[PDB]
Ligand binder design. Structure first.
Ligand SMILES: COc1c(/C=C/c2ccc(NS(C)(=O)=O)cc2)cc(-c2ccn[nH]c2=O)cc1C(C)(C)C
Length: 557
């Protein structure tokens, strides 16, 4: 029951890859320890192949089937619709990988006759054949990190015509089913502010709270044929059109269960028998499976009043403590049950008794004060990876601007406000690119955002307090300051000095640029302005934001 079989053919790149941090005239103003930053390339794909390849054994008990029966009962209340070809076409990212059949993502988006005719033939083939394995491309992802080197992660995706078909059959399912099945435990329905609120309320709801995060080692490869057929049985509980039931059965049998792996040069690399990382159902499938195995493992471990918070393969559990030593034994039983379900741990879970010490989705809860001095909980993270990625993005244009996603999602943080905002607004001002729409990702979905709209977006997600937070925790300040020395980033005092200049430069431009100066950099001046709601913020169409997760799902809004 191997996750993969391999032929020995290499996982090949599509273009020239860089691993060393590119340097330009702006690099040193952000980060001096250049050797600390690197990008993963296809060159390390061979090491990843070794890591993701293993036998999976599954032992399914009554706790597993009990939880699954409960999930199916909630899934049976979902009604889902088929998207038209045109609706699914418009969800395609403009720079999505081109089809092998003579058309690209722009042809799909423009509803070109050639693209639409091929998509209709792919749809007809899904309905008429529910057996033939569908071809997939295997590629090494190019992602940036700080040292202490990770081998490249792999992406496995079917052809563009198939991806549009996945959307038609399952977009509405993967968008609506997880919240119905898991209720408040589904993490992707929350903005960062709502996530904090859920975590704090859950922690407060326990007499003696204990919490842990569970890290499954190589989650996609732990996903078995059983798991994928179980996911399909959940999707089939929905009230669906008969053509959608047939397409979902066909996509499960031909694509989701497994299939051949083809490199960028057209060679057969091998065969997958686990979760594909680049399909529409990756996020929803991972969330349902992680929640199912974890809920059953919570029952097997006799964990008391377990509240789960699940986002794909990321899991946080908050429960009632039975004292430190019993909690430690309980987590070892939880881990044993997860292992039997084919979800073994990477790092062993650690019980926590301070909400701020739990790391989930690479983040933790922290506290600052608003302008009235009131304590305000917000989400932050170690800024090492956002800063290494910001350094790369300082010298190279990339398809996804992590700096923009990080300013949006981490706007209340000390590090996103003082460093990311200051640095990228300085660069954009100098290039007169404040109005240029840039691509970023939020919960795996692609968005095209104009940096000039950042004050309005931040206000809608985090509220006006994101522009007034101060008196950050000693722990948070020290982690940020430690990260800056480690990477050779100028200290916060330099950033405050630079921000006064950036703020003045933005105010000089007037209009939307002045609003950026006013709201984003009010922290930098001694004579603070009283910030009031932005009228443009109410007009923002933030629908489609914080509904579901779409990592690897080829979704654009
Ligand atoms: C839910 O946690 C997040 C997440 C979580 C993302 C996430 C988590 C798990 C997975 N797993 S999978 C492959 O199986 O779908 C996939 C994506 C992402 C961001 C984020 C940061 C910057 N730019 N874009 C973003 O989406 C911020 C937060 C916080 C702030 C709410 C903690």
């Amino acid at each position: 029951h191997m996750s993969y079989t391999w032929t020995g053919a290499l996982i090949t790149p599509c273009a020239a890859e860089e691993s060393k941090l590119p340097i330009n005239a702006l690099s040193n103003s952000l980060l001096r320890h250049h050797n600390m930053v690197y990008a993963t390339t296809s060159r390390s794909a061979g090491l990843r192949q070794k890591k993701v390849t293993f036998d999976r054994l599954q032992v399914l008990d009554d706790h597993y089937r009990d939880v699954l029966k409960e999930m199916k009962a909630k899934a049976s209340t979902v009604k889902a619709k088929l998207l038209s070809v045109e609706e699914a076409c418009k969800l395609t990212p403009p720079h999505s990988a081109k089809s092998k059949f003579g058309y690209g993502a722009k042809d799909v988006r423009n509803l070109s006759s050639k693209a639409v005719n091929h998509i209709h033939s792919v749809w007809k083939d899904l309905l008429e054949d529910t057996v033939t394995p569908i071809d997939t491309t295997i590629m090494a992802k190019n992602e940036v990190f700080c040292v202490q080197r990770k081998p490249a992660r792999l992406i496995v995706f079917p052809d563009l015509g198939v991806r549009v078909c996945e959307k038609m059959a399952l977009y509405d399912v993967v968008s609506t089913l997880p919240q119905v099945v898991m209720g408040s435990s589904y993490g992707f329905q929350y903005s960062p502010g709502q996530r904090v609120e859920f975590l704090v309320n859950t922690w407060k709801s326990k007499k003696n709270p204990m919490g842990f995060s569970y890290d499954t080692r190589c989650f996609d490869s732990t996903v078995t044929e059983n798991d994928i057929r179980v996911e399909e049985s959940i999707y089939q509980c929905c009230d669906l059109a008969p053509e959608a039931r047939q397409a979902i059965k066909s996509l499960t049998e031909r694509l989701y269960i497994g299939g051949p792996l083809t490199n960028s040069k057209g060679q057969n690399c091998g065969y997958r028998r686990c979760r594909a990382s680049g399909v529409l159902t990756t996020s929803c499938g991972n969330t349902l499976t992680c929640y199912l195995k974890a809920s059953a493992a919570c029952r097997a471990a006799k964990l008391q009043d377990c509240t789960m918070l699940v986002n794909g393969d990321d899991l946080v559990v908050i429960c009632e403590s039975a004292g430190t030593q019993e909690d430690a034994a309980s987590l070892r039983v939880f881990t044993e049950a997860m292992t039997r379900y084919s979800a073994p741990p990477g790092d062993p879970p650690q019980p926590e008794y301070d909400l701020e010490l739990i790391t989930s989705c690479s983040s933790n809860v922290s506290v600052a004060h608003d302008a009235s001095g009131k304590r305000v909980y917000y989400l932050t993270r170690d800024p090492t990876t956002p800063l290494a990625r910001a350094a790369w993005e300082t010298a190279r244009h990339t398809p996804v601007n992590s700096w923009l996603g990080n300013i949006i999602m981490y706007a209340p943080t000390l590090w996103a406000r003082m460093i990311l905002m200051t640095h990228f607004f300085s660069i954009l001002l100098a290039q007169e690119q404040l109005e240029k729409a840039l691509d970023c990702q939020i919960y795996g979905a692609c968005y095209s955002i104009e940096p000039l709209d950042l004050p309005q977006i931040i206000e809608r997600l985090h509220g006006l307090s994101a522009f007034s937070l101060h008196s950050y925790s000693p722990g948070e300040i020290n982690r940020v300051a430690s990260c800056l020395r480690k990477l050779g980033v100028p200290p916060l005092r330099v950033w405050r000095h630079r921000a006064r200049s950036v703020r003045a430069r933005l105010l000089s431009q007037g209009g939307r640029a002045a609003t950026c100066g006013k709201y984003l950099f009010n922290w930098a001046v001694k004579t603070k302005l009283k910030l009031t709601p932005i009228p443009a913020a109410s007009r923002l169409d933030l629908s489609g934001w914080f509904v579901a997760g779409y990592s690897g799902g080829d979704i654009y809004h």
